[PDB]
Amino acid sequence: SSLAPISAKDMLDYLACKDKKPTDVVKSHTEVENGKIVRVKCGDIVALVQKAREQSGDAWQGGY
Amino acid sequence: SSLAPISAKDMLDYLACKDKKPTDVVKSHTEVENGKIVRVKCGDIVALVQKAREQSGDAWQGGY
Amino acid sequence: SSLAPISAKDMLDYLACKDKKPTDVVKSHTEVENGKIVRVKCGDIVALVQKAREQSGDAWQGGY
Amino acid sequence: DISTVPDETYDALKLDRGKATPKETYEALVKRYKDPAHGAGKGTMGDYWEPIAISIYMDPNTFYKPPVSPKEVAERKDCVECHSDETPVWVRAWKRSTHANLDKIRNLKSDDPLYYKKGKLEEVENNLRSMGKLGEKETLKEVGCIDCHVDVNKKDKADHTKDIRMPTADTCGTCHLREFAERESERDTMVWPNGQWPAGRPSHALDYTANIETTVWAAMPQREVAEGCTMCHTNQNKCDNCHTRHEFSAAESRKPEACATCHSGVDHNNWEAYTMSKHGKLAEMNRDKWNWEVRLKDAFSKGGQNAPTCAACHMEYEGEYTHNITRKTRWANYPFVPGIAENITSDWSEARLDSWVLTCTQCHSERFARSYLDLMDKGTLEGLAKYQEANAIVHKMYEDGTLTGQKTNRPNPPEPEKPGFGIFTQLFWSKGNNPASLELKVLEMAENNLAKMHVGLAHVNPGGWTYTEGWGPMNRAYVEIQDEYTKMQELSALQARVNKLEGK
Amino acid sequence: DISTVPDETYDALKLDRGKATPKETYEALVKRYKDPAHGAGKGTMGDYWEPIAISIYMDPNTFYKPPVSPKEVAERKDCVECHSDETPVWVRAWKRSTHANLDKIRNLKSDDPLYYKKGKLEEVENNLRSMGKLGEKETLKEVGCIDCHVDVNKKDKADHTKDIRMPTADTCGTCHLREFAERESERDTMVWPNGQWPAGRPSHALDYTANIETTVWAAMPQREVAEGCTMCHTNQNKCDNCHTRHEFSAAESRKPEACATCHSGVDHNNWEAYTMSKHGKLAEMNRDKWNWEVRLKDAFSKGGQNAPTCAACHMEYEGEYTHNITRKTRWANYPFVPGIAENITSDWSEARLDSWVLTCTQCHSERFARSYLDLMDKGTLEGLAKYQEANAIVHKMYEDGTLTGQKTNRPNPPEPEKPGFGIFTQLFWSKGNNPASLELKVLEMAENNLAKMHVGLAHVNPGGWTYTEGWGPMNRAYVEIQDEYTKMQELSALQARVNKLEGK
Amino acid sequence: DISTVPDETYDALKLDRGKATPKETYEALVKRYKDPAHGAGKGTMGDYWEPIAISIYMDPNTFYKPPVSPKEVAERKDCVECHSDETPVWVRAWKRSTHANLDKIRNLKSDDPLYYKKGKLEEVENNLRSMGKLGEKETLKEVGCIDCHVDVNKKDKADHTKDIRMPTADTCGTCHLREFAERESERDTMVWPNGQWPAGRPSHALDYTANIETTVWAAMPQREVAEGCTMCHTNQNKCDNCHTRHEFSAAESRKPEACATCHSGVDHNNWEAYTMSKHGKLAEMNRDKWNWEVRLKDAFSKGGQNAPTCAACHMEYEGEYTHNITRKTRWANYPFVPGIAENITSDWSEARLDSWVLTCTQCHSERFARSYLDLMDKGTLEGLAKYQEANAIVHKMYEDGTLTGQKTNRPNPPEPEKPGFGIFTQLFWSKGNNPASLELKVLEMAENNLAKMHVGLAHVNPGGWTYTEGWGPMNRAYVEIQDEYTKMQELSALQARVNKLEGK
Ligand code: HEC
Ligand code: HEC
Ligand code: HEC
Ligand code: HEC
Ligand code: HEC
Ligand code: HEC
Ligand code: HEC
Ligand code: HEC
Numbered sequence A, B, C: 001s002s003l004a005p006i007s008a009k010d011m012l013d014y015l016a017c018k019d020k021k022p023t024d025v026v027k028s029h030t031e032v033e034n035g036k037i038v039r040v041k042c043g044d045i046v047a048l049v050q051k052a053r054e055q056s057g058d059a060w061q062g063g064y
Numbered sequence D, E, F: 001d002i003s004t005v006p007d008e009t010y011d012a013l014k015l016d017r018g019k020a021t022p023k024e025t026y027e028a029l030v031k032r033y034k035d036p037a038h039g040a041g042k043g044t045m046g047d048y049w050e051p052i053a054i055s056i057y058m059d060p061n062t063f064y065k066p067p068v069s070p071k072e073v074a075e076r077k078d079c080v081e082c083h084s085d086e087t088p089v090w091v092r093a094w095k096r097s098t099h100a101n102l103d104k105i106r107n108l109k110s111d112d113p114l115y116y117k118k119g120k121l122e123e124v125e126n127n128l129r130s131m132g133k134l135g136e137k138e139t140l141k142e143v144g145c146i147d148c149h150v151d152v153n154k155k156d157k158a159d160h161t162k163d164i165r166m167p168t169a170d171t172c173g174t175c176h177l178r179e180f181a182e183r184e185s186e187r188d189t190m191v192w193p194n195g196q197w198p199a200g201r202p203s204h205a206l207d208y209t210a211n212i213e214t215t216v217w218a219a220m221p222q223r224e225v226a227e228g229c230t231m232c233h234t235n236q237n238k239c240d241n242c243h244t245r246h247e248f249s250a251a252e253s254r255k256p257e258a259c260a261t262c263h264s265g266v267d268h269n270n271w272e273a274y275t276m277s278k279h280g281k282l283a284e285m286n287r288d289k290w291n292w293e294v295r296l297k298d299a300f301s302k303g304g305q306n307a308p309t310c311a312a313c314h315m316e317y318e319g320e321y322t323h324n325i326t327r328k329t330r331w332a333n334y335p336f337v338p339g340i341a342e343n344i345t346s347d348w349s350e351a352r353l354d355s356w357v358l359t360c361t362q363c364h365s366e367r368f369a370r371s372y373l374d375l376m377d378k379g380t381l382e383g384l385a386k387y388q389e390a391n392a393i394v395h396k397m398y399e400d401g402t403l404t405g406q407k408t409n410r411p412n413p414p415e416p417e418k419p420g421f422g423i424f425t426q427l428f429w430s431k432g433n434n435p436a437s438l439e440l441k442v443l444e445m446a447e448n449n450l451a452k453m454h455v456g457l458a459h460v461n462p463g464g465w466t467y468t469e470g471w472g473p474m475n476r477a478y479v480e481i482q483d484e485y486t487k488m489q490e491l492s493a494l495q496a497r498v499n500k501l502e503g504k
Helices: A008-016 A042-059 B008-016 B042-059 C008-016 C042-059 D007-012 D022-033 D076-086 D088-096 D102-106 D113-130 D145-149 D169-175 D177-184 D207-212 D215-219 D223-231 D270-276 D278-289 D310-314 D347-360 D366-400 D437-458 D471-502 E007-012 E022-033 E076-086 E088-095 E102-106 E116-130 E145-149 E169-175 E177-184 E207-212 E215-219 E223-231 E250-254 E270-276 E278-289 E310-314 E347-360 E366-399 E437-458 E471-502 F007-012 F022-034 F076-086 F088-096 F102-106 F116-130 F145-149 F169-175 F177-184 F207-212 F215-219 F223-231 F270-276 F278-286 F310-314 F347-360 F366-400 F437-458 F471-503
Strands: A025-033 A036-041 B025-033 B036-041 C025-033 C036-041
Touching: A008 A025, A008 A042, A008 D366, A025 D366, A036 A042, B008 B025, B008 B042, B008 E366, B025 E366, B036 B042, C008 C025, C008 C042, C008 F366, C025 F366, C036 C042, D022 D113, D022 D169, D022 D177, D076 D088, D076 D145, D102 D113, D113 D169, D169 D177, D207 D215, D207 D223, D215 D223, D223 E366, D270 D278, D270 D437, D347 D366, D366 D437, D366 D471, D366 F223, D437 D471, D437 E471, D437 F223, D471 E471, D471 F437, D471 F471, E022 E116, E022 E169, E022 E177, E076 E088, E076 E145, E102 E116, E116 E169, E116 E177, E169 E177, E207 E215, E207 E223, E215 E223, E223 F366, E223 F437, E250 E310, E250 F278, E270 E278, E270 E437, E347 E366, E366 E437, E366 E471, E437 E471, E437 F471, E471 F471, F022 F116, F022 F169, F022 F177, F076 F088, F076 F145, F102 F116, F116 F169, F116 F177, F169 F177, F207 F215, F207 F223, F215 F223, F270 F278, F270 F437, F347 F366, F366 F437, F366 F471, F437 F471
Parallel strands: none
Antiparallel strands: A025 A036, B025 B036, C025 C036
16 A cells, blocks of 8 residues: 655654654755754654554554 | 748648548647647548648649 | 956947047947947047046056 | 566566566566556547657557558568658668678677677577567568567568558567566556555656546647657657667667757756756767667676666666666656655665666765765755755645636636646646645746756756756755745735725 | 759759859859858848857858967978967867868778768869869868968968967868858748748848848847857868867767757757657667767668758758758757748648658658647647637737836847847847736746647657647746736736726 | 976975975974864864765865774785675775886886886885885885875784774875875965955865865754765865875876766756767777876877877876866866956966966867957856846845745744855755845856856867856846746735725
8 A cells, every 4th residue: 555645844854863862863955944954853753754654554564 | 042931830730631532530749628639531531731832823833 | 457348339439439539439339328229439449448548547468 | 598687577467487488478568568457548538648750659559540541552672762762861870780680690609799699689589589479480581660560570472551560569578578577667666655656657668648637638628739748658658769660779778878868958958958967978088989789787897888878877777778667767857746755765765776776886986976865865865855845835825715717717728627726737738727836836946946956966067956957956946936926915915904994 | 064953053053063063053052151151251230240250150251360479480280280289179079070181082992981071072182183182183182281371282381370270061062062062052942932931031041141130139239148159050161079079970960969068948949859759769779879970861761860860851952962951851840930830731732741751751650740740740730729819818918008017117228120029029128017927927838838849749759849848838927818818807907996996 | 397287386394305305394293183273173163064984085184084894904805805795896806906006007017107206106105215104125015905094104903993094195195195285285376366265275185175174064953965065075075076085097087077976067067068978978988098097297199199088188287287277277167256357357367377377288279279268258157147146136136125924934044154145055055045046046146157157168068058058047046036027016016005095
C-alpha cells in the first residue's frame, strides 16, 4: 500500500538529523525565515516522520 | 497567382478523407469540443476545399 | 579608482566618432526615434565622454 | 537454465529454471509477451485511437500486414538479390553484419577478445534445436532476410504478400532467448515497494504499454504528434533501437549515442547531462581509444574504457551485465511521484544504493561515490522542496477556483481523460484556459525542471542542477508563480473595492 | 555542356545547351550573378545601411579593396614565402590541400576511390582552356595564393595594394564551372507554383540577397548584430562555408558539421534535430568507419556510409548529386508561410515527395518512407493548426486595438520598415510596446516553435516535435496566450465597471 | 629561473628570478597559496556554511582526513595490489599513464614530437632534488599512488588511516613547479585598471575563493545545490579538472571538451558557442587528424591542427603557452560589470586586444582578425545598451517601490546577504516576491542573455548573438519588461480612479 506523504523539506530535515540526539539542532536545507536559515530540532522532525511511518503501517517495510 | 487560403485543420480533415466516401465520418486531427474529438463528414470538408480551389482558379494546377 | 560610467550607447557613439570632425554626424548604433535611427553629432558625444574622463581623473590611465 | 535471468521471472512464468528447456522458456515468455492482459495489443483505450500508417512498424504484432505488392514467391537468396536493388544499403549493411558472417564467429580463437560470440552462437543454435527450428547436427548458416522477416532457418519459398513480418522482440528472442528473457525480466524485477510506479515499470519491457496507457496519448486528436511519443516507446515491440537494423552491432548499442534519441529532452535530459558531465566529456574524448566491440563485462579491462557510459552503468548489476536496466532504479527520473521521495531512505532503496556503489567503485573509492550519491539524493529533495512550495500556492488557487478562466473557459479534455489540476494531459492538449498558465507553469516546474535537476545530479553535470537546468529554471518558475499570485491577489482586492463601491 | 545543370538554367541564360562552351556558360552565369537586378550589390535598401569592417569579407564584390599595406610587388612564390610568416597556418593548410598537389591528382589510378578527382581536374583544365586562361596543352600546375587572390594562372608580379581580391563564388567558378553552375541553377529550379517564396528562394544562390533584402536587417542600427545574420548568408558570395579555406576539403563539406553553423538555432534547428535523430546518432557513432573522401555518389557503397547525412539527403536528386539543394523542397522550414500548407497536396509537391521517397529508399522500403513522410506532413499541419488558433486570438486583439500599449506606446519601426502586426522586424527590433508581449509570443510560436516542430518532424527527432521542441513549447505559448487573453478581458470588464461608476 | 613565470610573480613572492632555487620558489608559492589572507580555507563567510561529505574532495587542504577504514599500513607496491579490485580502473588508467611509465619518457629521441617531455621529466627531477625529495644521482622511478597520495618519492610504509591525502595543486606543484607557478601567476597578472574584478580574478588560481566568497553560495540553505557551483570552481584546489585523474593526459586537457563541463551554460555558454562556430565544427570534424599529444606550441605545425581550440587560444600569450589564462582578458564574460565597458577602449584593453590579434593572425590576416574583434566589441556594447534601457525601467520601479510585492511580500535573503535590487543572490534564492518577476527577468537579461550574447560574439557563433542566444532572447526580455511595465501603469491608473471614487 501507499506511503503516508512526507514533504521534501521534512525528508531533508530527517536526513540531517540522522544519528543526532533529539535535542540537537540542525539547519534546514530549504527554509529561510527572517533572513536566517530555519533551525530544526531533531526531536521534532523525528516525531513528525515516525507519525507518518505509523500511519503508513505495513507500507513501510523498513529503512531509515 | 495566389492560392485561396485553407486552414491547417481543413487540410488535415481533407487528407483524412483521401479515398473515403463522402458519407464517411472521420475524426478531426485538431479539434476537441465538449470533451470529444470533433467528427468530420468527408463530403463536407471536400466541399469546403473544392470551393477554395474554385477561388484559386488556375493558381491550383492539380494535386489532391 | 573607478571609472566615471559611460552608457553603452555613448561608448558606441564615441567609437563611431573616432577620426571624425566634431561637425560630423553619425548614426546611433542603438537608438530609433520617430521611425528613424537617431543621428548623433560627434562633438556632443566627444564632449560627453571627455567630461566623464575628467570626473574619472587618474582612474583613466589613457586610451581612446 | 539462463543464469542471468532472475528467479522472479521463472517464478512468474511458473517455470523451474533447473528443468525448463529453451523452447519451454521461450514459449512461456512469449505467451506473456503477447497477452493483452500483460500489455500487448492496443491496451485499455484501444477504442479511442487508431493506428496511422507508420504504426505497422511501431507495433507490428498488432498492426503489421505484409505489403500487397510485390507479388513475389521468393527463396532465401532471392531476398538478397532483389533487395540489392530495392533496399541496397540494407543488403550492404546486412552482408557485413555478424548475422551474415556466422562462419567468422565459429572460427574465432579463444585469445580473441570477441571469442565470447562463438559461445553465444552455439547457445543460439542450442535454443533453435530445442525449438525444433534447427537440426541437432545442423549448424546455423546465417541470419538472413528470410530468417527474421519470414521464419527462422526457412528452407523453402516465401510469399511476399502473405509471409513477410516485421521482426519483433519475440522474433529476435527465438534465437537470442537470453537477451529477450533478461529484457522481459524487467517485468518481474521492477516492483516498487509501495506501487510508486506500476509493476515492471519504468522499463524497456513495458515502454510501449506505458505509451498506449497514457490517456492523452490515446485521447489527443494529433495522432502524428502522439506517434512521436510512440517512436521513443518501441523497445517493448522491437529490438533494434540501440543496436539498429540492419547491422545489429553490439558495439553500437554500447555507445551512449544509442540511448540518446529517447533519453533526452525537456523532461529527462540524460543525454545532455551525461554528455556535459566529465564522464561524458571523457567518453567523447576517449571514444576512439576504446574497443567498443568487447562486451560490457570486459569494457574496463580489455576494452580500455576509463570513463562510464550509459550502458555500462545501467546494465551493470552486482558485477554482471544483462539487458535488464531496472534493478538499481531508485528515483526513476521524476522526484515528485508520490512515494518516491519518501521511499528514498527505505531498505529497498538503500540496497539499490549499495548496488550503485558497486558500479561507481569500478573507478572511485566508495567514500567518494557515497558522498556524491548523498549529494544527488539531497540535491533532488532540495529541488522537490522548491517545487512543493510553488505547487501548494497554485493548487490552492485551483481549490479556491481562482485560476484564470477556471470557472468560465476551462473546457474538459478529450475522452477518456477526466478534468483535473496539473495533469500530464495538459502538456499535450490545451483549449481555452485548460490549463491556466500558472497551472502549466507549476506542472512544468515538476515534469521538466525538477526532473532535469535530478537528471543533472544523477549524471554529475553541475550546471545541470544549478545555473542552467534545475535550480535556476525552478527559481524562475517560483518567482513568476509568486509574482502572478501577488498580482492576482492585488487585482481581486481592487475588484472587491469596486464591488463595495457598487453596493453604494 | 554541363550534364548536371538543368535545362531551366540554360533557358534562363538564353543559351543552347547543345552549343554553349564553358566560356559562354561561365560569362552568362557571372553576368547574371553580378547583376544587381538579380541580387548582387547592396540591394534595394542600400541607402539605409553601410558596410562595417568585416563586410569586405562578407560581400567582397561590393566592398573589398586590397589592403593599403604592405606595399609589396609579389610573385607566386613570394605569396607562399612571406605568408609562411604572416599567416603560417594558411600556408600550411594550403600546402597540404588538393589545390597545392595537382600532380598527385594527375597520377591517381583507376582503382583509387578518389580517381574521380583526376577527371575533375581535367574538366577544370578544359574549362580554363575554353576561357583562354590556360594553354590547350598547358597543365594547370597548382591553385596557389596568387591564383585565387589575384588571377587564375597568373605568371608574373602582383601589386599587393592593387591586385589582391577575396575569392568569390565566380572566382572559384572560373575553374569549378560545374559546381558554380549547379549552385546558380538554384535560381532557376526553385520556382514556387504560387510564389510562396520569391523565385530561386530559399537557396544558397540567393542567401545574401535574401539577407540584405530583409527590412529589419537593413533598418536596425545595431549593425554588428545584423552582421551576425550576414555571416549565415554568405554562400551567394563565397564558396568556403562548407569546404572552408584554406584546405577546401570536400570530405569536410560532406560532414553534417559543415552545415551546422548556419542550419541551427531557434527558427530552424536542423543540426540539433538531425544529430539527435537515429540518423545523426548513427552518423556520430560511425563517422570514423566511413570514407568521407569518396564522392556522395559513392558514399553508401565505397564510403561505407550507412546512415544519411545532410549532404547525402539534400544534394541527392533523382539518383545524382549536385550543388543544387532546392529541388526537393516542399515545406521550406516555415510551415505558416501563406500558400505553403495549401500547396502540400499539389502535384508539384507530390513530385518532390516522390523525389524524397527515392532518397529514403536507398535504405528504407518505400512503404516505410512514405509512412513517415505522411507523418511528417500531417504532424506539421497539426502544429500549424495549433498556431493558427493562437494567432487568431492575438490578431483579433490587434484589430480591436487592445494589445498592451497598442494605442499609447507603440512607436514605429525604423525606416524603411512599415508598422504592422507580428512582423519579422519585431524579432530584432523593439521599442516601448512595439511589439506587445502577446504579439511577440504568437510570432515566435510560428517563427521558432512551429518551425522547429517541422524541422524535428522532417529530421526524425521525436522529442523535437513532441516534448522538447514543437508541440510542448507551442502548447505553452497557446496556454499563455489564452491566459493573458482572459486576464485582459477581465481587466476590461473591471475597467468598464469603474467607468460606469464614474458615469455616476 | 622559470622562463614562463612573470616577473610580477617573483616580485610578489619577494624572490630573485636568477637566484631563487626550485625549493624556494615552491615554498614561496605554497605559502601564498595556503594563506587564508590570499584565498585559502573557508573564506570570510565560513561561519555561515559547513562542508558536506563531498567537500573533502573539493577543498582537501581544509576538509580532507583519510578514511578511518581500512586499517592498513602499505608500501608503494601494496597500493596497486589492493586497489586493482578496490578501484580497478584507477589502477588500470594509472598503469598506462605517463606517470607510471617514466622510462618511456627517458627513452624519447630528440626528433620525437613528444621529446619535450623528457626535458620536463628532468626539470621535475631537478625540482625534487632541490627540495630534497630525490637524491642528486637518483632517478625518479615513477609517480605512483603513494607519491601523490602520501609523499613524493616515499620509500617506506604509509598508514592508510593517517597518511593518505587528496593531491592538491601544491602537491602536483612539488614536481610540476613550472605549471603550478604559471597557474599561481594568475594572481599577479590579472590586475584590472579600475578594480573591475578583484586582483587575480577571474582566474583558475582563485576560482574556489571566488565561489566561497559569493554570498548566496555561503548563505543559501540548499548546500547540495551550492556544491554544484563548487564543482565548477575547484581548479584552485586541485589540478585534475582538465587533464583528469588518473590518466593525467595532457592530450586530453588540450581538447575543447576538457573545458566544457565548467565553461558552459546559461551565463557563459562558451562550450556551446565555440562548438557551433566554424572553428569548433572544424575541430569536431578534424579531431582525428590532429596529434593531440604534441604540446600547444607545436599544435599548428607538428600536430596538424588547423582550427583553433579553447586551450590554443586562451593559453597563448605573446607566442608562448602557459597555464596562465588571464593575460588577454578584456570583457571577462559579463559585459555589464561596472567599468568593463568603459575600459574596453583603454590602452590596457588595446594592448590585450593586440595580444588577441597576435593569436588570431597565426591564421587570419590582421585586417580580418581586427575587423571581427571590432564587431565583437561593438556587438557586445549593442547588447549592453539594450539591457541598460530595460534595466533603467525596472530599476526605477524598484527605487520608486512599485515592484510587485515589493512592500508587502519581499522577505530578506539569508544572512549575511543584504537586501537589494537585481542581485546575484536572487538567481539562487527566492522567497515570496523576493525577487519580483520583472526584477529576475532584467537580472537574467544581463546575467544570462547579455553574457551569452558576448560569448557568442567572442567565439564566432552568429546564431549565438542574433536569433538563438543574445539579441533574440534579450529582445523578448525587453518586450516583456515593457509589456508588464505598461500593464502595471494601467493598473495603477485604474487603482487611482477607484481611489478617487472612494474619496467621494
Ligand atoms: C523483388 C523481385 C523482391 C524479392 C525477390 C523480395 N523482395 Fe522484399 N520487397 C521488394 C519490394 C519492391 C519492396 C517494397 C514494397 C513497398 O511498398 O515498400 C519490398 C519490401 C520488403 C520489406 C518491407 C515490407 C514493409 O512492409 O515495409 C521486407 C521486410 C522485405 N521486402 C523482405 C523480403 C524477404 C524476406 C524476401 C525473401 C523471402 C524478399 N523481400 C524478396 C522486392 C522484393
Ligand atoms: C537466429 C536465426 C537469429 C535471429 C532471429 C536473430 N539473431 Fe542476432 N545473432 C545471431 C547469432 C547466431 C549471432 C552471433 C552470436 C552473438 O550473440 O554475437 C548474432 C549476433 C547478434 C548481435 C551482435 C552482432 C555483433 O556485434 O557482432 C546483435 C546486436 C544481434 N544479434 C541482435 C539481434 C536482433 C536485434 C535480432 C532481432 C531483430 C536478432 N539478432 C535476431 C542469431 C540470430
Ligand atoms: C554512472 C557514472 C552513470 C552513467 C554513465 C549514466 N547513468 Fe543514468 N543514472 C546513474 C545514476 C547514479 C542514476 C540515479 C539512480 C537512482 O535512481 O538513484 C541514473 C539514473 C538514470 C535513469 C533513471 C533510472 C534510475 O536508475 O533512476 C535513466 C533512464 C538514466 N540514468 C539514463 C542514462 C543515460 C541515457 C545515460 C547516457 C546518456 C546514462 N544514464 C549514463 C548513473 C549513470
Ligand atoms: C587494502 C589492503 C588497501 C591497500 C594496501 C591500500 N588501499 Fe587505498 N583504499 C582501500 C580501500 C578499501 C579504500 C576505500 C575506503 C572507502 O571508504 O572508500 C581505499 C581508499 C583509498 C583512497 C581514497 C581515499 C578517500 O578518502 O576517498 C586513496 C586515495 C587510496 N586508498 C590510496 C592508497 C594508497 C596511496 C595506498 C598505498 C600507500 C593504498 N591506498 C593502499 C584499500 C587499500
Ligand atoms: C610580405 C613580404 C608579403 C608578401 C610578398 C605577400 N603578402 Fe599578402 N599580406 C602580407 C601582410 C603583412 C598582410 C596583412 C595585411 C593586413 O593588414 O591584414 C597580408 C595580407 C594578405 C591577404 C589578406 C587581405 C585582407 O584584406 O585581409 C591576402 C588574401 C594576401 N595577403 C594574399 C597574398 C598574395 C596572393 C600574395 C602573393 C601575390 C601575397 N599576399 C604576398 C604580406 C605579404
Ligand atoms: C583553378 C585555378 C581552381 C580554382 C580557382 C579553384 N579550384 Fe578548387 N580545385 C581545382 C582543381 C583542379 C581541383 C582538383 C580536382 C577536384 O575537383 O578535386 C580542386 C579541388 C577542389 C576541392 C576538392 C579538394 C578535395 O577535397 O580533395 C574543393 C572542395 C575545391 N577545389 C573548392 C574550391 C573553392 C571553394 C574555390 C574558390 C575559393 C576553388 N576551389 C577554386 C581547381 C581550382
Ligand atoms: C613527481 C613525484 C610528480 C608529481 C607529484 C606529479 N607529476 Fe605529473 N608528471 C611527472 C613527470 C616526471 C611527468 C613526465 C614529464 C611531463 O611533464 O610530461 C609527468 C607528466 C604529467 C602530465 C603529462 C602526461 C602526458 O600526457 O604525457 C600531466 C598532465 C601531469 N603530469 C599532471 C600532473 C598532475 C595534475 C599532478 C597532481 C595531481 C601531477 N602531475 C603530479 C611527475 C609528477
Ligand atoms: C579563438 C579563435 C578562441 C577560441 C578557439 C576560444 N576562445 Fe574563448 N575567447 C576568445 C576571445 C577573442 C574572447 C574575448 C576576449 C576579450 O576581449 O575579453 C574569449 C573569451 C573567453 C572567456 C572570457 C575570458 C576573456 O578573455 O574575455 C572564456 C572563459 C573563454 N573564452 C573560454 C573559452 C572556451 C571554454 C573555449 C573552448 C570551448 C574557448 N574559449 C575557445 C577566443 C577564443
